[PDB]
Structure 1
Amino acid sequence: SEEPPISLDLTXHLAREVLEMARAEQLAQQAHSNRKLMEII
């Protein structure tokens, strides 16, 4: 019910998944896509 905030702490760790991976995949798509468009113009 009330517990140590276990899910949150673990989210602390796997933020390297859902924030670093997510943010990286965004930077990747928005690098290469943007750089393709930019490379065109």
Structure 2
Amino acid sequence: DLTXHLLREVLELARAEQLAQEAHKNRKLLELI
């Protein structure tokens, strides 16, 4: 009752964000180590 509402912009955005996110979480994944 809120999730299914999300996606869309996300499922889509991720498409345009399928480059930043990585480098993003990477900035942490590299520190998480």
Question: Under TM normalisation by the shorter chain, which class is it?
Answer: 0.3 to 0.5
Superposition TM-score, scaled by structure 2 size: 0.36
Q: Report the structure number with the largest CA radius of gyration.
A: 1
Which structure shows the bigger proportion of residues in helix conformation?
A: 1
